[PDB]
Amino acid sequence: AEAGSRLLAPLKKPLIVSGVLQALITLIELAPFVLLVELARLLLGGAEAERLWTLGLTAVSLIGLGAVLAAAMTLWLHRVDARFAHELRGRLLTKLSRLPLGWFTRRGSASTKQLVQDDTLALHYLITHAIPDAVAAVVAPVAVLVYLFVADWRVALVLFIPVLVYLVLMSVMTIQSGSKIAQAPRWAERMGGEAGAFLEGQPVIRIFGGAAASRFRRRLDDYIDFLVSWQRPFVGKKTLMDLVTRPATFLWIILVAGVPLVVTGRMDPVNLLPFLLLGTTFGARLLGIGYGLSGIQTGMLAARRIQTVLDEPELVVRDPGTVELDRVSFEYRPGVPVIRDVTLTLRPGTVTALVGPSGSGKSTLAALVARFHDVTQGAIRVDGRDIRTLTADELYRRVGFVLQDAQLVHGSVAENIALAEPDAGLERIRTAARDAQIHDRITRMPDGYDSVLGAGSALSGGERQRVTIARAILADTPVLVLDEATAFADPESEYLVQQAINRLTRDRTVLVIAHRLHTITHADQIVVLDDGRIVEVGTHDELLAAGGRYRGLWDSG
Amino acid sequence: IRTLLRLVPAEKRGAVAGYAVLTLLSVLLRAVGAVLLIPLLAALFSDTPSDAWLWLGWLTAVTLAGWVTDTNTARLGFDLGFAVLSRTQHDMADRLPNVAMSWFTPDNTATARQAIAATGPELAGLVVNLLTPLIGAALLPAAIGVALLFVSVPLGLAALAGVAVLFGALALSGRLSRAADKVAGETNSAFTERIIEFARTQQALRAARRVEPARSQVGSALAAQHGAGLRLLTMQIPGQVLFSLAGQVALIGFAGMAVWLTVRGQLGVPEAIALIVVLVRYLEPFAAIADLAPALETTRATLNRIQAVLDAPTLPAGGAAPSIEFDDVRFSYGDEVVLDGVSFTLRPGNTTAIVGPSGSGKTTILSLIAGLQQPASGRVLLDGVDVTTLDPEARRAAVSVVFQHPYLFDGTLRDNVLVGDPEADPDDVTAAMRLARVDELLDRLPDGDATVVGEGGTALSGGERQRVSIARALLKPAPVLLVDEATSALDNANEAAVVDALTADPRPRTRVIVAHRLASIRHADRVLFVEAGRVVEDGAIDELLAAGGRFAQFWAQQQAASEWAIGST
Ligand SMILES: Nc1ncnc2c1ncn2[C@@H]1O[C@H](COP(=O)(O)OP(=O)(O)OP(O)(O)=S)[C@@H](O)[C@H]1O
Numbered sequence A: 001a002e003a004g005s006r007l008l009a010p011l012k013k014p015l016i017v018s019g020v021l022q023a024l025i026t027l028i029e030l031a032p033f034v035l036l037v038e039l040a041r042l043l044l045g046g047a048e049a050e051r052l053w054t055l056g057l058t059a060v061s062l063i064g065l066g067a068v069l070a071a072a073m074t075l076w077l078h079r080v081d082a083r084f085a086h087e088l089r090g091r092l093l094t095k096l097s098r099l100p101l102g103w104f105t106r107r108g109s110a111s112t113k114q115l116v117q118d119d120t121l122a123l124h125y126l127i128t129h130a131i132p133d134a135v136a137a138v139v140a141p142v143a144v145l146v147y148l149f150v151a152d153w154r155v156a157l158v159l160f161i162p163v164l165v166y167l168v169l170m171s172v173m174t175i176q177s178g179s180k181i182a183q184a185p186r187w188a189e190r191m192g193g194e195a196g197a198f199l200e201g202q203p204v205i206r207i208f209g210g211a212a213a214s215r216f217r218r219r220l221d222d223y224i225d226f227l228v229s230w231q232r233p234f235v236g237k238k239t240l241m242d243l244v245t246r247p248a249t250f251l252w253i254i255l256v257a258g259v260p261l262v263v264t265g266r267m268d269p270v271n272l273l274p275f276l277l278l279g280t281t282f283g284a285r286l287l288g289i290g291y292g293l294s295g296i297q298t299g300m301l302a303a304r305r306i307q308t309v310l311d312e313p314e315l316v317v318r319d320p321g322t323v324e325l326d327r328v329s330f331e332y333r334p335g336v337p338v339i340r341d342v343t344l345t346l347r348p349g350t351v352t353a354l355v356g357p358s359g360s361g362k363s364t365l366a367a368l369v370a371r372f373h374d375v376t377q378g379a380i381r382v383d384g385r386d387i388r389t390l391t392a393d394e395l396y397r398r399v400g401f402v403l404q405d406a407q408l409v410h411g412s413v414a415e416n417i418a419l420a421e422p423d424a425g426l427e428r429i430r431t432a433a434r435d436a437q438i439h440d441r442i443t444r445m446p447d448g449y450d451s452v453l454g455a456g457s458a459l460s461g462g463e464r465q466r467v468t469i470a471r472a473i474l475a476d477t478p479v480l481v482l483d484e485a486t487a488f489a490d491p492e493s494e495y496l497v498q499q500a501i502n503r504l505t506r507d508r509t510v511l512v513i514a515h516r517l518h519t520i521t522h523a524d525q526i527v528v529l530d531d532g533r534i535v536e537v538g539t540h541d542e543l544l545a546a547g548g549r550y551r552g553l554w555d556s557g
Numbered sequence B: 001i002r003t004l005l006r007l008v009p010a011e012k013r014g015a016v017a018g019y020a021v022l023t024l025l026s027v028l029l030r031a032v033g034a035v036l037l038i039p040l041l042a043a044l045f046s047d048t049p050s051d052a053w054l055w056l057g058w059l060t061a062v063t064l065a066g067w068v069t070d071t072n073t074a075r076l077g078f079d080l081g082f083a084v085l086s087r088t089q090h091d092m093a094d095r096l097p098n099v100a101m102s103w104f105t106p107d108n109t110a111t112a113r114q115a116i117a118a119t120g121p122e123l124a125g126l127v128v129n130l131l132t133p134l135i136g137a138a139l140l141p142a143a144i145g146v147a148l149l150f151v152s153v154p155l156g157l158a159a160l161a162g163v164a165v166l167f168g169a170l171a172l173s174g175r176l177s178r179a180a181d182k183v184a185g186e187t188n189s190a191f192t193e194r195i196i197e198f199a200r201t202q203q204a205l206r207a208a209r210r211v212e213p214a215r216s217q218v219g220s221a222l223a224a225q226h227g228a229g230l231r232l233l234t235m236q237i238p239g240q241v242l243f244s245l246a247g248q249v250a251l252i253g254f255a256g257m258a259v260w261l262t263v264r265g266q267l268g269v270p271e272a273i274a275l276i277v278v279l280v281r282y283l284e285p286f287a288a289i290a291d292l293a294p295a296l297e298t299t300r301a302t303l304n305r306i307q308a309v310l311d312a313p314t315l316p317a318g319g320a321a322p323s324i325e326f327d328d329v330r331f332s333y334g335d336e337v338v339l340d341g342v343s344f345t346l347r348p349g350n351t352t353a354i355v356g357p358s359g360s361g362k363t364t365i366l367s368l369i370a371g372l373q374q375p376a377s378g379r380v381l382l383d384g385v386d387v388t389t390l391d392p393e394a395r396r397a398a399v400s401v402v403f404q405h406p407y408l409f410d411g412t413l414r415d416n417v418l419v420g421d422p423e424a425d426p427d428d429v430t431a432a433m434r435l436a437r438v439d440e441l442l443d444r445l446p447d448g449d450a451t452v453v454g455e456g457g458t459a460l461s462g463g464e465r466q467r468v469s470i471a472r473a474l475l476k477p478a479p480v481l482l483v484d485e486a487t488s489a490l491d492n493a494n495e496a497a498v499v500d501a502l503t504a505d506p507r508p509r510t511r512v513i514v515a516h517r518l519a520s521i522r523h524a525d526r527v528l529f530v531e532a533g534r535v536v537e538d539g540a541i542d543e544l545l546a547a548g549g550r551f552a553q554f555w556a557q558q559q560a561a562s563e564w565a566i567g568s569t
């Protein structure tokens, strides 16, 4: 709860000043409804035309001042909002450059798009619209109530009859429907998921048909019946509550409570005019507070998300390519081990393959080797130096990586290939591309090597993967984490990517994340992982002769 | 919005007529309740307030009538809202299976998902939360203005003109508000679009050791754009201020006109005060419309989505191995062309094996053969009969397909298998599970063939999902069996199952396989090498191998690739 407020801490005083100005603007907005009561006081006195011209001047001045104050306040608030939002984007930029690389491979949480684009816009709306609108929606009914009570308390009290009846019926409906309203969002997300599944499985319905449509139709009918059974018994309460707060009912109550007082002489007939002017619409004004509070809540949720981002755990810097894993243990979630006391020594020049069943956690160990995360226990040493004491450049000029879902940077193809070493000449880029088996395709492109890449381009997956492999070749990293799934990412161009990987694995201490067993039989070392722990270590022949888990995996293959 | 007239079911049309006439009655009763304040407050402010009792009696009688009509309209509103929700949802659910597959673009898929998912509570209470208050607030100022003609012709005429002026102000305020919101979203997206690129390429920038120059560049760009970004949103200021200022200026105008008529002697002071109060009743509805405007915008968006889904195109209507034949077929995903004068013929029973590069229209050709899509030009024949003219039942019964994705649903593995032919006997089901090598998976599963295969039930890997998909395809008695391969090298049993499906299946049906590896197309009687949407080589396996063409190069590449191993050459 405090996280949401902590983000908006520097905007304390500007928000308070904006709230004060909005209270002033709302009180000025209701000024003509008091000048009209004064006009009624004046006409019945039959005074001169000057005493009405001055009142007209006052009303014109007050509406003009209200408009000018609203314009000035919204200008200043937009300026402060832009000033704060630029600072927030600047602070999020640095955080994205210090969060661990594994943070960007998250799941079960909002993507960066919703997290920086939509949430910052939500904060903008919170600062500029939701807070001033809510302050207005709170100041208006309070000021109206105070003015009505000042006018005549006897007729001000009868306005609590419909308001209290509205509150009573609302409370009865809410308590009577606590279980259903608690259960409603679960039904909503369930129906959303079912609709997505029904739309995804359209071709099966198209050809096979069957009960695929009826399965979704039953869910839809259940949802409709749930809504009907939820809202049908509350028809009477809802409609009576709606009737009570209508302006016409307020007017009738006002007149029935005022005419007896006015006729008997206990009340000045002019004092009833405030109630007829402002008090009759009091129900709609009290109903509007919830909308402003909902707006504030919606903004503060986005504030919560952004602050939860800004306090993530960013990578701490403590203090011939051999890699030593020393009692490494890792937990993505606390209390849920994924790696448990694994020890290894990737000797120099040895292709230490990594193999295990799906969900065994073999990719995780390579991720820790590249320092996508920090090992919770033990330590990972590269060249005898713990990775935790190596700054980012020093680490990543020692431990490169070629993992799945290769990313391209906005720029020329001669920039993507030369990202590690931009000073490399064009001939070095060309021979690196030849080594990656991509020089054939790049020359086929119209602009050649200067073609702009980015979010989308003419190259398919099996070609941008080879461009990234060319970049990894040119970076010249002694250690090299490798994801073997890149070999068959595009099965059409499997052979070219295999040639590129064979050239990339020339003289590097490689840690292959093996999915296919038959591409490992020449590996200088193989590690069998299951349940996040090493079981059997040795070459292909030794592991098969041992008659262990590796023999079972090989036979299953 | 006129779409609601189509959305409401035909059996509730009488309810619509009753709702309309009772809403008009309610607005008339509220107008009489407001206009009755003229004589009532004329008597109250006079020297004999006792004359106000009669008008108070009439006003409270009108209020009772208004309460009765309002509760009737509310009951009808709840009934009609639930009815139209049910009708719209059922029509949308029934329409979609008949919608042509060309319509299912990802934006259209998103709109349909939103229409099915988030439209429950909104359409449930649409007509009570939005239509009744909106119509009441829209018609009541007109009703009071018209009813004030008799009290005073100039005052009533001025009020009636003010109705149009204030509705114009409301429309202008809505235009400026939504345009300003659009501009705000645009500038925020423009500012943050570089942070998205910084986050997406974070691995590449970090690994290449360019994170510091890249971050400095992004920050400098943000600062430079923010320096010039202080000139934005000059039209947001009259967003809501314009409407409120217009309303208050109208209030001052009406009050001043009442004062002027009092000075001119056409109205008494008590009736002048009463007219001020009544013309404050007149402006009160316009606030309600402004409050309801965002909800109206959301409802308009939802109804636009429902209209888009309900107006989607529909496919026109119309056991030996068929001969699949193409006659200059052309197809395009909008503007991009996927086929260009492709023509070929598949012999009945001969296991054709399409191969070629990616994005070359292989899966597209299989889809056109299966009738999921239609050919934009030319004909797709099954034994000389155009696919478009096939009956829907014959359309389903003709072709069986193994899709690239498995397309499984939550439920028992058995029930997933039976959807190929739910009337199939246990013998055929056992044969299909054996030919698909699903019986091996049954040993893995705890409960056997009845095991739930949903994500919450059992998390199957790719090989098992593809094997049950092959079982689905084999079970159905379709004379055509397309196999769009997505076989994974992590499961050799999947390849064995595909080979069994193309070989061990006893039903004499033509088969078309879009293959990546050489495990399956070894048993291919003919091959169609499809490159860039045009068949470049056609013939037998050995013929193409001897010719030394493109297919020979593909065979050499795939055969060499299978013998790949790291750390040796
Ligand atoms: N961020 C995370 N949050 C929760 N669980 C995680 C996370 N990352 C990994 N896991 C768990 O780690 C196990 C899988 O480890 P991974 O290395 O990520 O995948 P994997 O074992 O390599 O799968 P394959 O098919 O072998 S690549 C599963 O039990 C996951 O639930």
Ligand SMILES: Nc1ncnc2c1ncn2[C@@H]1O[C@H](COP(=O)(O)OP(=O)(O)OP(O)(O)=S)[C@@H](O)[C@H]1O
Pocket (backbone or CB within 6 Å): B333, B338, B357, B358, B359, B360, B361, B362, B363, B364, B365, B404
């Ligand atoms: N739903 C879609 N929306 C837009 N373009 C599409 C869609 N489906 C396919 N395409 C494109 O249409 C062209 C032909 O693709 P396909 O019909 O899948 O042929 P393909 O070679 O079998 O594709 P793959 O990669 O092998 S599965 C390619 O350029 C695809 O990117």
